RNA sequence: GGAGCGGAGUGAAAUAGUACCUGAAACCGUGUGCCUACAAGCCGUGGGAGCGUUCGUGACUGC
RNA sequence: UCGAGAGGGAAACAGCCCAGAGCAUCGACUAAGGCCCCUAAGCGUACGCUAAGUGGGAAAGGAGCCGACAAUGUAGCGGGGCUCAAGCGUACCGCCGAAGUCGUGUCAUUGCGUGAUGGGUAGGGGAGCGUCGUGUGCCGGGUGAAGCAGCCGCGGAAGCGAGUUGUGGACGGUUCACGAGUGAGAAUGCAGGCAUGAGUAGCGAUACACACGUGAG
């Protein structure tokens, strides 16, 4: 239908097939048939699904120790090199998860660049990003935001 | 002592260029070039003309330049290119007209 | 008349074998 | 010279040192001897057919290789219907080498 | 996402074309016509694969009464004979004695000749 | 192991002659084309020639019982409009027996490319002289059994 | 005559030569192993001798 | 019963007779039907009938016979041939004969090692192969990836090979999930290329010939 012309039925006892329209879906140049479309793929899922999820994969991570907390990143100026070697102390794991509060300028500025390390506040701790670290480090400040 | 050359893009049908070709196979070099030489097909020259060159790639490449202990090792004719143009005729319609070409390659060898 | 099917491989190179040209 | 022994519901022809393919016999390992219930013995004009004597004799082999043959490739098809099974199927069998026959 | 079914289509059509490689004319060339035709030529092994083994019993009892009548007793009779001296033996190998060892075989028939009753026809 | 099947030299050719003074014209076929076929020796193969060469004498004097001598007709047309000819034996078997014991032989045998060449292997003669005696022939009676 | 080609040269690569990355199938050829001119063939399949650069072909025969 | 049913027989012959195919088997016994040759097994044994090739088509009716009689070519036994039955009847003996049954090996559904079970169209349920992409962990690649062409192996199927060779010259494998423009042989389907017809029909309406010249022709 929104293909741009086919308008026009080809032709009639011609001796070929029939057809409606240059642009059906046979035809080279033609129309998709069942083709895709916008749509919006989000689920509902339960508050207390995604939660109970959240408290499973943190649990998880305590159970083999590896929540970790800091009362801070780094001390006074921002330096990628301080996070660098605090995170290099606390483990040499490949994945990483850094949960501060966004008013926290200095560790996230410190700790973005690190390549392996990914930085949450802590209202927006998720399940997909504490499964897919190896370690969880929450700084003093994030760990009772979260918890309380 | 294989020397050989083709021509490429000879504007003569494949079956045509072969009825020629067919003849020339194994035989003298120059016993070759006097059967080309009196053959009543239009084929034959340029056949002949790439049965020079060879004979003259024998000669000057591989200094081979007796050119009478040489026959005809190979000799065969590939399609090629075709054009395809078309042709009026009666009550509207129209008929394809394919115009054929050929590669004509030729093989010389010591005997 | 009309070819009523395409003609085998076979049948098609009998006959040209026979549209060949003579030695001189 | 050579004894005909019966191996898996399919009789044979063997003489010592054969290596002869039976049906699987999967009681028995790689090295294992096993005896084979005789169906007649022929020794030059000596031709012992007497079952009550052929019951005491037992061909003895021994378990050369388990193996499976080549690969057989089966199709069921009925026209016009749309039916088409396709299978395929190995028979696995054992070589055994015949070393006596005892007399 | 568009999926191009070039890599994935090819990969029976291989198949059948090694399949078909040996058939005459058109059969071993065009991937419709060959698989057309290799469905016929699995169709008749699988018959003809189970259909030997009378065919071949039909060969062994060919050889077996043309032996049998070589020594003055007739297959019909030869195997009742053998029956009823318990000598059991395949007539895969009871052909093979005919051909190579006909002493062998000329040795069963006495057997099976004695194993008869003395008149044939009398009611059993 | 497999069944035994005949190569080209286990093949060993005789030469039988069947005299058929006064025997049955369909008994003399039968035991000719057995003969022929290679049927009746161990080394029989259904796709190889193993007979042996049929002579046969007297060829005309096959006794041929009931009223078959002036009903039975031998047809054969030629393909042109109205081109059947039948020939009773009577006729047939008076001036051409050799004709007619060949197509009874012939009949009793495979009509492929090799029961023609089974049936090259069957001489027959009206006489009791067949030019064949330099092949050592030995004489073949018709017997039954037990 | 030209086209085109054979040497030569550039290039890592010239069956990458401006008709040009990869280059399938239909289709068309050359060489080569086997079979094929007394034979009736949904062109296959079972049995099977022979020949040959397990493999290639397949006289003859059953379906 | 076919439809939706393979296999054997009736010469061929969906619906008739025998028999219900998981797969392999160069073992055995049988069913319908057969055992002179084509064609596996009996020119079977014994008694009796048929003279018409009846068997191998038919009526009233007449004294196994007559009645009997259409068109391409024998043609109303499948053919040869058969009464020296290889025909019909009645006994006796034996054998051949299927994918049936038994024997042997192997897989699958189902109930409790064992029992039963596994043809199948419309259709219902289950388990999977392959292609592309995404997240994730682990890996490969100028020491030659993808793609293509073979060779050698592997799987019950769709198919596979972190085997190998050639071509090729920069991108792939795989675990668990996730998404689908995810599988074509047919729609007088659509586009490109190429065959058959075939070196065939045609080359489009009245006349050009000679000498010389140019020219590689």
Known sequence: GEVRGGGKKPYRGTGRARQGSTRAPQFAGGGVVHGPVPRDYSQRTPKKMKAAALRGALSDRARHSRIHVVTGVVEGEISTKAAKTLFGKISERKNLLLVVERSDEAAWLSARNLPQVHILEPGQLNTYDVLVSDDVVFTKAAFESFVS | ?111 | ?24 | ?103 | ARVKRAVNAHKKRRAILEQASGYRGQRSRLYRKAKEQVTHSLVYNYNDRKKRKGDFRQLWIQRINAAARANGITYNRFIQGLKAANVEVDRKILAELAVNDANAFAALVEVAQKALPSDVNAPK | ?146
């Open chain 3, 1 to 24: 008349a009309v070819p009523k099917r395409k003609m085998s491989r076979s049948n098609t190179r009998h006959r040209r074998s026979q549209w060949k040209a003579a030695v001189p």
């Open chain 6, 1 to 146: 192991m497999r069944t035994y099947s005949p190569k080209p030299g286990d093949v060993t050719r005789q030469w039988h002659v069947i005299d058929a003074q006064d025997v049955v014209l369909g008994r003399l076929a039968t035991t000719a084309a057995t003969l022929l076929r290679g049927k009746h020796k161990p080394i029989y193969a259904p796709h190889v020639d193993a007979g042996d060469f049929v002579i046969i004498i007297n060829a005309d004097k096959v006794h041929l019982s009931g009223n078959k001598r002036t009903q039975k007709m031998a047809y054969r047309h030629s393909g042109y409009p109205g081109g059947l000819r039948s020939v009773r034996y009577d006729d047939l078997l008076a001036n051409n027996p050799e004709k007619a014991v060949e197509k009874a032989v012939k009949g009793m045998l495979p009509k492929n490319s090799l029961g023609r060449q089974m049936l090259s292997k069957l001489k027959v003669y009206a006489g009791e002289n067949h030019p064949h005696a330099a092949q050592q022939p030995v004489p073949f009676e018709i017997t039954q059994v037990a």
């Open chain 2, 1 to 111: 002592m294989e020397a050989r050359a083709q021509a490429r893009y000879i504007r003569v049908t494949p079956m045509k260029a072969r009825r020629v070709v067919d003849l020339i196979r194994g035989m003298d070099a120059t016993e070759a070039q006097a059967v080309l030489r009196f053959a009543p097909q239009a084929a034959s020259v340029p056949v002949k003309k790439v049965l020079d060159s060879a004979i003259a790639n024998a000669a000057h490449n591989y200094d081979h330049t007796d050119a009478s202990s040489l026959f005809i090792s190979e000799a065969f004719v590939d399609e090629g290119p075709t054009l395809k143009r078309f042709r009026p005729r009666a009550q509207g319609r129209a008929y394809r007209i394919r115009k054929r070409t050929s590669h004509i390659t030729v093989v010389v060898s010591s005997k």
């Open chain 4, 1 to 103: 010279m050579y004894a005909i022994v019966r191996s898996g519901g399919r009789q044979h022809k063997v003489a010592v040192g054969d290596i002869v393919e039976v049906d699987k016999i999967s009681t028995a390992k790689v090295g294992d001897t096993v005896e084979l219930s005789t169906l007649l013995v022929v020794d030059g004009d000596a031709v012992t057919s007497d079952p009550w004597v052929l019951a005491g004799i037992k061909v003895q082999a021994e378990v050369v290789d388990h193996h499976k043959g080549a690969k057989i490739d089966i199709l069921r098809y009925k026209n016009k219907t749309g039916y088409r099974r396709r299978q395929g199927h190995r028979q696995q069998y054992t070589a055994i080498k015949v070393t006596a026959i005892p007399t």
